[PDB]
Design a protein around this ligand. Structure first.
Ligand code: ATP
Ligand code: ATP
Ligand code: ATP
Lengths: 104, 113, 116
């Protein structure tokens, strides 16, 4: 009975640069340590420096990964950022050539 | 009720000219969806020398996640502001978003955007 | 009879920085040369406490390649990138294919799969 309804999701988080370390630890602890980080800038509702964290998940429920990031990135002040979950159709593991959720 | 984006969430991703960022920012504010995330990127589009075949040109990736504003209106606002009429103007893509979380409050779904 | 079931897909690849040149060539050869590149860093899946410490603090430099496709099957684009980026060692990265609903060509105002 597979998480993410047997499929693959991209968890994209825009967070405070100084919260990256915590988020990395939280991802490891939740059992989905894989991430890709980009230096970015933006604004919510003159651009502020942020970090975009991307985690593609299959074995771990996307919401649990997102909640792990949210908790670790939370301060309670404006600028904490947002997390978005996008569908992923397919994945390929470059080293092996394995496909689908098994490649994640 | 008639919520835009069929009651859901969309990611508007635009690859534009670096010097068009200021205009795009203004256009986004004016259309009522000012939120954006910017990345410095490089790329090339479709097919003598190396200029328009192999080399990568500096661009800006603009990402806007929307719910209250129709994705197409946000995309049109970016397109208009980024337009010059010359090769290199870039492209805008709209991707589905399933779910969202506002980190400060823990609010979820379309309300988080 | 249109590829990608008549629709649009985003091919996202996280690869070794030194494999970018090869991937660019492979994309041209497969007939879908369009790409957007970002400098990124990350880590993959998880004995000693030092190599365990190096994991929890250290991110490795990678390149994110993004190709939005319509006329070329997303899998063929992904396979072209995979082949060119392959070394057989840990760190080779991964390729993800995401659905795309719509696209706008900024220059012309053309929309849909035709804008890709
Ligand atoms: N809808 C969105 N689309 C794209 N990027 C966003 C969006 N919302 C937030 N971001 C990114 O997250 C960063 C901070 O977001 P945040 O929501 O904290 O802004 P804010 O104006 O402080 O809002 P709030 O007061 O509700 O926290 C922004 O700099 C931006 O890069
Ligand atoms: N299918 C695509 N996938 C990813 N990025 C793209 C794609 N098409 C365009 N881009 C981005 O847009 C930037 C420039 O715009 P574009 O490539 O559309 O102009 P062009 O193709 O050179 O000219 P024209 O669109 O008039 O043929 C490129 O540097 C690239 O980063
Ligand atoms: N699930 C994922 N989500 C986001 N990014 C990922 C994911 N998996 C891998 N990456 C990106 O790809 C890069 C290399 O990944 P790769 O999977 O080759 O590392 P690895 O897990 O050590 O190798 P292997 O998969 O062969 O065990 C990482 O640095 C990371 O940025």
């Amino acid at each position: 009975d597979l998480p993410n309804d047997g499929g693959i999701k991209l968890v994209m988080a825009i967070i405070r640069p100084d919260k990256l370390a915590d988020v990395k630890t939280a991802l490891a602890e939740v059992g989905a340590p894989s991430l890709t980080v980009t230096n970015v800038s933006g604004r919510g509702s003159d651009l502020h420096q942020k970090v975009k964290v991307e985690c593609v998940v299959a074995d771990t429920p996307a919401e649990d990964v997102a909640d792990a990031i949210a908790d670790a990135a939370h301060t309670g002040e404006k600028g904490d950022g947002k997390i978005f979950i996008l569908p992923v159709e397919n994945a390929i593991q470059v080293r092996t050539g394995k496909t689908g959720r098994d490649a994640v």
